[PDB]
Amino acid sequence: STENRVIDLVVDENVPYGLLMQFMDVDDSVYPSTSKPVDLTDFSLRGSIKSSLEDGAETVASFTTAIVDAAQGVASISLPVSAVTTIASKASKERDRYNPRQRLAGYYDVIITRTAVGSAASSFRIMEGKVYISDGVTQ
Amino acid sequence: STENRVIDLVVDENVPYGLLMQFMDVDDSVYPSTSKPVDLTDFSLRGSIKSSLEDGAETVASFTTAIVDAAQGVASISLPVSAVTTIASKASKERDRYNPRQRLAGYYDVIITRTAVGSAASSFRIMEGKVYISDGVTQ
Amino acid sequence: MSTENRVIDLVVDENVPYGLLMQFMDVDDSVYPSTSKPVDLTDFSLRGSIKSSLEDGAETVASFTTAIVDAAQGVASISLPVSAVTTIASKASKERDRYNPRQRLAGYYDVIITRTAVGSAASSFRIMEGKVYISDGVTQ
Amino acid sequence: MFYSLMRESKIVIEYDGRGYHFDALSNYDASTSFQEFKTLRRTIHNRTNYADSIINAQDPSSISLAINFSTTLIESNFFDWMGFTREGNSLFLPRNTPNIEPIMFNMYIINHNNSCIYFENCYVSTVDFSLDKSIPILNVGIESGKFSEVSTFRDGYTITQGEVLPYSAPAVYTNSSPLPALISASMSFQQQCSWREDRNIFDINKIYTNKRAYVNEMNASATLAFYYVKRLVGDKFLNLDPETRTPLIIKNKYVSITFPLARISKRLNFSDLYQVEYDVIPTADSDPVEINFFGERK
Amino acid sequence: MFYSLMRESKIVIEYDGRGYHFDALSNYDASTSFQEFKTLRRTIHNRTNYADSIINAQDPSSISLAINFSTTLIESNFFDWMGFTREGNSLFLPRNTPNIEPIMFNMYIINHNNSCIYFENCYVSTVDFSLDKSIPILNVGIESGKFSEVSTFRDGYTITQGEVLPYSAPAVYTNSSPLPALISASMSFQQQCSWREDRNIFDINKIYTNKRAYVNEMNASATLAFYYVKRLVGDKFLNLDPETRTPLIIKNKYVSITFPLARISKRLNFSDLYQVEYDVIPTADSDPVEINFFGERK
Amino acid sequence: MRLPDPYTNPEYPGLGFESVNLVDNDPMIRDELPNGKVKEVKISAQYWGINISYPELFPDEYAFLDSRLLEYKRTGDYLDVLLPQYEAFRVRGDTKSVTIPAGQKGSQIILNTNGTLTGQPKAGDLFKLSTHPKVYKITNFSSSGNVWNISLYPDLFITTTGSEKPVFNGILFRTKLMNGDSFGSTLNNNGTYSGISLSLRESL
Amino acid sequence: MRLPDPYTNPEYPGLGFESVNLVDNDPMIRDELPNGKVKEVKISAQYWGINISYPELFPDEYAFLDSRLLEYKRTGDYLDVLLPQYEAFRVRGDTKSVTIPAGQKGSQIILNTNGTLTGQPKAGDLFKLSTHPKVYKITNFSSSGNVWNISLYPDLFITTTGSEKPVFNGILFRTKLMNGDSFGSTLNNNGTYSGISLSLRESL
Amino acid sequence: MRLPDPYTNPEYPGLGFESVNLVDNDPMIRDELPNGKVKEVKISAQYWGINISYPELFPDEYAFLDSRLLEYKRTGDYLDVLLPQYEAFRVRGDTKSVTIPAGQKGSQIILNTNGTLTGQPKAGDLFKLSTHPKVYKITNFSSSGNVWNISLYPDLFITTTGSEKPVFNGILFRTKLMNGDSFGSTLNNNGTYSGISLSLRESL
């Protein structure tokens, strides 16, 4: 368990990217952990892809948040193929050790937010990590 | 894409190549072996082969894609014998000391796409890896 | 198992006509174990050849005289006569195998089956490959 | 006469009618023996001194091979023969053991002058390799039922191991967060079969050889050794508490063993520099354990 | 990040609310671990491969310390905590074990950057030192019930071990007659306690730690090694016959273990130079075994 | 009277139940006809049998446990036994505004919760009425609005008078200690008491 | 009713037989004549006996299992079980269009598939008629085209009426519990119910 | 009907007899007088008892063995058991030209081999007549020319009619399976069947 916010995204060159997050609320009080999904009301997600963590870093791209099926908790984060091309343009020429197709493009993090659901701006970061562009061959 | 699911294709020289996929979604939570063949209606996959894994690479061949069975889930990726001959001509000559039949030709990817009215671009990458040519003598 | 499955080695014996008997059979294992049926080999022609090396310019030392003994039942046979065996033995490397001195390297080989038919399914597959070795003899 | 040198040998495994000559073999060890029934019939009439020993069975052989990783990935067939399901170049640990009996194959140990030892009814019972600061090598352990001496044999001229893969430093991740201060990642996979002895009264005055066996269990395991490192006071990520379920992957440039959900137990040693040791096994409901085999360029 | 070096550590024993920092520590060894309940539920329906393992208990820790003798004699508290009665600077072995449960104390193993490992519910189970031609050192062995990681701790700034005592040759006497040709006098004292496992169904889904223990026995023992020396033909003083009761004392310039009445068993080894070996235990009705601790000038 | 357990008395950890044995005792007259049909007849009542095992006990733990058991044998009270595995809190709220229609003598309780109770009971849980000491296990539960249909293993030992109130949490077994005719415990030379076992039977 | 098992409830893999003992129980009037000849007369009906042993059951799995068993004990119906070793689906197809000609008694049976079934039922497999709940065991098989001749170990309990349909898959034994009178479950300190076993017995 | 053994069915090596037990059952009324003389009385017949033990059985081996045993229990036939240790071929030739004089009802067979048989039977071998299923052991044998004097342990169960022909090789025990009233085999979680034992009795 503990914390696992750090996960790295590998986006594909020349292909639009879309991620599907099934938000969930597991509780291990009872031995079969409760599968209750969180209910997505007054929730907005924001995420930017910025090269390096230093202050003043240029914004490589910005995630486009989608909220669908609020009852069952799922949500989608995506960005158009034009955003993918803009990301791939500024990616470094050095390739990842384990995969000779990925190249480090920047860092990211998405931040959930409650906007005055109880007169509170309860915004906290969901996940984080590095964004990797995977060089394509089709185009 | 599927970075962990890279598979190297092997094409025989002097032989037309043929590879068939099966898009067949599963849900085994109800019971094991609950698999439903995905409808492939109005899906069009396409791909290419390039000599190097970078921009400006020379294209080697483009797979002659098809949809063998619509609504049955059996797609096919393939290319004719002349294209295989072109690949063999363009392939490198750094033959291995213990696999003297296989030479590297290039890198490949194929993208599935949805062209449905009332929908938008749904391009997604499903294959990734290298194309290896196996030498032949019987012509 | 990318190519490990369809590769076996042949050792033609010197001064003997070499004949290999093949039996095609469509074995079903994924659906259920122990289910196999022969392949209807009508219109499924065979052809093979042997060459000394894998380079672009290679010598055609021999060529199998393939024949379909049974149209149904998936039975075929690849064989070469005594003259071809003698040519292979003469045109073979003089370096002897250490673990079996009678065997010497002759060359490489492939087998392609061409199922040309009226139906537009004129597919071709490479069903065999490997190396060809010659086993020396004295009975002459 | 002809002596038999280990360095002048060739090990060919015969499966499905094809010879898998396993080159890049660092070292192998094997032995053959027979089982005896030696009873001493000391009686009040004659307190004898000479036993009644008859050789009636062949003791199963225990062959161990040490095989270097190769670019053609023939060595993954040992996982394939041991029971793992295959998709592409990745081997899955199935949720349930597929069949009752293991996958049986024959093995030859060739030597010069048509000398050979023929092990039959073999099965792969153990495969473990240590990802460390030395070149990785997987020690496979197979058990035979019948051994024999034969004149002609099967020699894998074509199916052979290529060049050994270059060394690459191991790294273990949780999702995508690296685990610091790795020392030695050792992975272990087993197919703990058992011989079914069916020696009966119809085999009297004959030599019996084991023929059939059944799989007691399959498992995937890994022991990870770290240095006790903490980044914060009262850290939550790095501590000694057990982890019921956590995604783990022991990754290399050419191989990556994946535990979709892992049960980790920690053990601290107060040595010269404090070392923690993990005990990683997949959970009850975890997805199949992955073993990817990347030849070159992933 | 922060690595943990054994040489950069400080061991503080917490008893009665006071910290006994045991300096002059030559070497210590410790380990922590957890107990698991791993069962594999293979059924005719599903011959599974994934075990059902849950961590439910902390395996008791076995900490061993090697402590040099010191001028302030803090190390005699280990005899004091292990159960010996005290009068002045001499420790008696009581005729009967005083209490059912041992004397429990906590122990810290401090390190830099507020890092610590907290062993709780400890008891001294073994103390043995060899009076020999090397510097004497007593290896104590304590067993813990619960181990933990804590941020702040107890550090014995004042209560500490002084300078190590200078070496002095051992000598064993009978009354006041010296025993010739001594080689190595090894003394051993134990408090052979046992953990009372009380893991019950109210501890399901929780980690259990041992808390209570009872003393099976206490004892004082010594093994003396001599060279087989005889002064007369048919000597009576020095021979191989057992001695039911004889007053013995293994004396040094800084310590003297006294057996008011001893049961000696002898063992002769026909080595390069013949060696006899004693096995000294106090008799049934012997007076309490003495252990004197002389700092300086007796 | 409550049997000492590490809920009320955690200072005596040796008083925990090392292993419980919930025995289903429902005597029946079973006859097997030669035509292959097995036939049963039930007359007597079903009583839950509880067997408790204990580890080695220190003098204070044994002193407390023995004092409680002797108090039981003196006043002739009823030992109450709590099983932790049956203490999952599902139904929460007030059980005083719920009504149980009278005249229910079968093996099934129909009650109108009146919307005052949150959650739903799960099959295999422990259920008990407020006016009778017998303990029931829920074998099935169907909820159609506010009216609940709880099915119980033992046939209802009482006919509902309309004043009974369902009890879902905090259920105790009104047991009576069997094997008390010859009850003892050996004290070893190391000071701990061994060989202590409680064979309890539900004396409703 | 149906006995829970991983096929009906895959979420409980602890259910499922660790070992099943399928005993044959044919009472017989055996007599050992003084001349060496052994004469045995079959009068009492034969019945399969099933002894099921369970692995370590966690509290929730045992709650489900004993809830189902107590529902069995309450409503008093029969308890069906499905042995998985005999679940090899060796006969595909739908058996409604398979006719069994009327007036057949004894071990032998003749049924006409009318070219519908695919797959041959080998000896040792189970067989059960649609109407009667008895479970037989195929001992020998012989087919001449579409017509199948099957020999069953227990003689046909009822003579075929021309409407009984073969059931080559999903055969359930209509059994009754034989451990009901005293059925206890022990809970360990590890948190699992150990040594849960059933002695079933086919009724009729 | 022949019991499956690795002579007829070597593809199932688990069907071999791990250990046979040839039991000599000859009930007698033995009385010991106070004068030290022990006296016996024999009325009932002697029957050879055979006990077979088996190792762990794979599904196919058990399927074959169970199919054969169920075929036996269905047709009510007689299991034939072959003991390999008694299959030493000494007497060879034709047993049709040999004549056995009639009227022999004792414990001794006098037969004129007519010079048609080579070799001589050894004491302790198995001997049987062609018209009766009882199996005899040769306790003594004296040959004076062509006439043989074979002595048998069980007293001749039939009076020779002059048409009987001696059988020396290929002798089978016409046994009937005892303990078939409660016959079963437990299937372990590893797929192998265990606990299979055949208690056979010679039902002539």
Among candidates D296, E52, B75, B8, which has minimal Cα distance to G192? E52
Q: Which DSSP helix (H) or strand (E) runs through G69? A: helix G59-75
Mention every residue, 6+ apart, whose C-beta is less than 8 A from residue G75. Answer: G1
What is the C-alpha separation between D227 and D179, in angstroms, rounded?
10
Q: Is A103 helix (H, G, I), strand (E, B) or coil?
A: strand
What is the C-alpha separation between D113 and H51, in angstroms, rounded?
52
Chains that touch H (3 or more CB pairs under 8 A): D, E, G
Q: How many CA atoms lie within 13 A of D184 on its CB side?
A: 8
What is the C-alpha separation between D121 and D58, in angstroms, rounded?
13
Q: What are the phi and psi torsion angles at D255 (to 5°)?
A: -150, 150
Interface touch C110/B138, C-beta < 8 Å: yes
Q: CA A27: distance to chain centroid? A: 24
Interface touch D256/B4, C-beta < 8 Å: yes
Interface touch D246/A100, C-beta < 8 Å: no
Q: Which of E44, E46, E205 sits opposite G13 (nearest CB)?
A: E46
Tell me how far CA of residue E135 lies from CA of D47, E168, E293, in angstroms. Answer: 61, 8, 16
Beta bridge partners of D238: none
Mutation choice for D interface testing from B21, B99, B107, B134 by most D CBs within 10 A: B99
Size of chain C, expressed as the number of residues it contains: 140
Per-residue H/E/C for E110-167: EECCCEEEEEEEEEEEEEEEEECCCCCEEEEEEECCEEEECCCCCCCCCCECCCECCC
B9-12 and B124-134 strand pairing: parallel
Q: Hey, what are E80's tokens?
A: 């004091």
Please give the resolution of this entry in Å, rounded to 1 decimal.
3.9
Interface touch H182/G24, C-beta < 8 Å: yes
A46-50 and A59-62 strand pairing: antiparallel
What is the C-alpha separation between D227 and D212, in angstroms, rounded?
46
Q: What are the helix (H) ranges across chain B?
A: 81-90
Q: What is the largest CA-CA distance in chain B?
A: 55
Q: Which DSSP helix (H) or strand (E) runs through D118? A: strand D115-131
Per-residue H/E/C for E30-71: CEEEEEEEEECCCCCCCCECCCEEEEEEEECCEEEEEEECEC
Q: Hey, what are C105's tokens?
A: 């390297």
Give the F window 32-71 contacts with G, CB below 8 Å: 34-38, 49, 51
What is the C-alpha separation between H175 and D212, in angstroms, rounded?
31
User: Which one-letter DSSP state was computed for residue D233?
Assistant: T
Interface touch G7/E48, C-beta < 8 Å: no
Distance from CA of G99 to the nearest CA of F (A): 28
Cβ-defined contacts of F191-194 (< 8 Å, 24+)? F191/E100, F191/E214, F191/F58, F191/F59, F192/E100, F192/E196, F192/E214, F192/F56, F192/F57, F192/F58, F192/F59, F193/F56, F193/F57, F193/F58, F193/F59, F193/F62, F194/F56, F194/F57
What is the C-alpha separation between D141 and D31, in angstroms, rounded?
13
Q: Residues D69, D72, D78, CA angle at the centre, nearest 5°?
A: 60
What is the C-alpha separation between B92 and H197, in angstroms, rounded?
69
Any idea which residue has 């820790």 for tokens? Answer: E61
Distance from CA of E201 to the nearest CA of F (A): 6
B46-50 and F92-93 strand pairing: unpaired
User: Which one-letter DSSP state was computed for residue E289?
Assistant: P
Q: Using CB atoms within 10 A of its CB, is residue D48 exposed (0-12), middle (13-18) or buried (19+)?
A: exposed
Per-residue H/E/C for chain H: CECCCCCCCCCCHHHCCCEEEEEEECCCEEEECCCCCEEEECCCCCEEEEEEECCCECHHHHHHHHHHHHHHHHHCCCEEECCHHHCCCCCEECCCCCECCCCCCCCEEEEECCCCEECCCCCCCEEEECCCCCEEEEEEEEEECCEEEEEECCCCCCCCCCCCCEECCCCCEEEEECCCCEECCEECCCCCEECCEEEEEECC
Mention every residue, 6+ apart, whose C-beta is less than 8 A from residue E212. Answer: E101, E195, E196, E198, F13, F14, F58
Mutation choice for D interface testing from H15, H56, H65, H196 by most D CBs within 10 A: H56
Type of residue at F10:
P
Q: What does the buried/exposed string (b/e) look like for F148-157 if buried means 16 or more CB atoms within 10 Å of the residue's CB? A: bebbbbbebe
- Rounded (to 5) percent helix, strand, coil in chain B: 10, 40, 50
Task: Say if F and H touch: at least 3 Cβ pairs within 8 Å.
Answer: no
F123 has a chain G CB within 8 A of its CB: yes
Interface touch D273/E6, C-beta < 8 Å: yes
Report the chain B residue with the minimal C-alpha distance to residue D258. B4
Any idea which residue has 């003798």 for tokens? Answer: E69
Q: Is D32 helix (H, G, I), strand (E, B) or coil?
A: coil
Q: Hey, what are G91's tokens?
A: 């006969």
Query: What are the chain G neighbours of H132 within 8 Å (beta carbons)?
Result: none
Any idea which residue has 């003396």 for tokens? Answer: E224
- Residue H196: CB atoms within 10 A of its CB come to 22
Q: Residues G154, G160, G166, CA angle at the centre, nearest 5°?
A: 75
Report the chain C residue with the minimal C-alpha distance to residue B10. C2
What is the C-alpha separation between B13 and C56, in angstroms, rounded?
12
Among candidates B10, D13, D90, which has minimal Cα distance to C6? B10
Q: What are the phi and psi torsion angles at F86 (to 5°)?
A: -105, 20
Interface touch H191/D203, C-beta < 8 Å: no
Distance from CA of D294 to the nearest CA of A (A): 10
Mention every residue, 6+ apart, whose C-beta is less than 8 A from residue H158. Answer: H129, H131, H132, H134, H164
Report the chain G residue with the minimal C-alpha distance to residue F18. G189
E259, E170 Cβ separation under 8 angstroms: no
Per-residue H/E/C for H105-128: CCCEEEEECCCCEECCCCCCCEEE
Q: Residues E178, E179, E183, CA angle at the centre, nearest 5°?
A: 125
What is the C-alpha separation between E140 and E125, in angstroms, rounded?
8
Chains that touch B (3 or more CB pairs under 8 A): A, C, D, G
User: Which one-letter DSSP state was computed for residue A95?
Assistant: B
- Residue D269: CB atoms within 10 A of its CB come to 17
Q: Hey, what are F11's tokens?
A: 């200072």
Interface touch H180/G26, C-beta < 8 Å: yes
Among candidates A63, A72, A79, A71, which has minimal Cα distance to A112? A63
H24 has a chain G CB within 8 A of its CB: no
The distance in angstroms from the start CA to the end CA of chain B is 37
Q: Using CB atoms within 10 A of its CB, is residue A29 exposed (0-12), middle (13-18) or buried (19+)?
A: exposed
Beta bridge partners of D28: D65
What is the C-alpha separation between F126 and F134, in angstroms, rounded?
11
Q: Locate the DSSP E strands across B54-118.
A: 59-61, 66-69, 74-79, 102-112
Q: What are the phi and psi torsion angles at C50 (to 5°)?
A: -130, 135
E235, E276 Cβ separation under 8 angstroms: no
Q: What are the phi and psi torsion angles at D290 (to 5°)?
A: -95, 145
What is the C-alpha separation between H140 and D43, in angstroms, rounded?
27
Report the chain F residue with the minimal C-alpha distance to residue G68. F139
Among candidates G125, G96, G124, G123, which has minimal Cα distance to G112? G96
What is the C-alpha separation between D216 and D253, in angstroms, rounded?
33
Q: Is E292 helix (H, G, I), strand (E, B) or coil?
A: strand
Tell me how far CA of residue F115 lies from CA of E62, F112, F162, in angstroms. Answer: 58, 8, 18
Q: How many CA atoms lie within 13 A of G122 on its CB side?
A: 10
Q: What are the phi and psi torsion angles at G61 (to 5°)?
A: -60, -45
Any idea which residue has 């930017």 for tokens? Answer: A48
The DSSP string of chain C is --SSSS---EEEETTS-EEEEEE-EEEE-SSSSSEEEE---TT-EEEEEEES-SSSS--EEE----EEEETTTTEEEEEE-HHHHHHHHHTS-SPBPSSSTTEEEEEEEEEEEE---SSS---EEEEEEEEEEEE--S--
Per-residue H/E/C for A7-60: CCEEEECCCCEEEEEECCEEECCCCCCEEECCCCCCECCEEEEECCCCCCCCEE
G18 has a chain H CB within 8 A of its CB: yes
- Residue F42: CB atoms within 10 A of its CB come to 14
Tell me how far CA of residue G138 lies from CA of E123, G109, G135, G150, H68, in angstroms. Answer: 69, 10, 10, 7, 11
What is the C-alpha separation between B96 and B93, in angstroms, rounded?
9
Q: What are the phi and psi torsion angles at F106 (to 5°)?
A: -80, -135
Interface touch E202/F16, C-beta < 8 Å: yes
Size of chain E, expressed as the number of residues it contains: 298
Beta bridge partners of D54: D37
Q: How many CA atoms lie within 13 A of H135 on its CB side?
A: 25
Q: What are the phi and psi torsion angles at A85 (to 5°)?
A: -65, -40
Among candidates B43, D216, D222, G63, which has minimal Cα distance to E42? D216
Q: What does the buried/exposed string (b/e) look like for B9-24 if buried means 16 or more CB atoms within 10 Å of the residue's CB? A: bbbbbbbbbebebebe
Q: Hey, what are C137's tokens?
A: 């003899």
- Residue C135: CB atoms within 10 A of its CB come to 18
Q: What are the phi and psi torsion angles at D236 (to 5°)?
A: -100, -35
The DSSP string of chain F is -BPP-TTT-TT-GGGS-SEEEEEEE---EEEE-TTS-EEEE--SPPEEEEEEE---B-HHHHHHHHHHHHHHHHHT--EEE--GGG-----EE-SSS-B--S---SSEEEEE-TT-EES-PPTT-EEEESS---EEEEEEEEEETTEEEEEESSPPSS---S---EE-SS--EEEEE-S-TT---EEPTTS-EE--EEEEEE--
Per-residue H/E/C for D122-158: EEEEEEEEEECCCCCEEEEEEECCEEEECCCCCCCCC
Strand order in the sheet with C60-62: C10-13, C124-135, C103-114, C45-51, C60-62
F137, G73 Cβ separation under 8 angstroms: no
Q: What is the largest CA-CA distance in chain C?
A: 52
What is the C-alpha separation between C70 and C52, in angstroms, rounded?
32
Q: How many CA atoms lie within 13 A of H72 on its CB side?
A: 21
Q: Using CB atoms within 10 A of its CB, is residue A59 exposed (0-12), middle (13-18) or buried (19+)?
A: exposed
Query: What are the chain B neighbours of G7 within 8 Å (beta carbons)?
Result: 31
What is the C-alpha separation between B23 and B39, in angstroms, rounded?
8
G192, F40 Cβ separation under 8 angstroms: no
What is the C-alpha separation between F159 and F152, in angstroms, rounded?
14
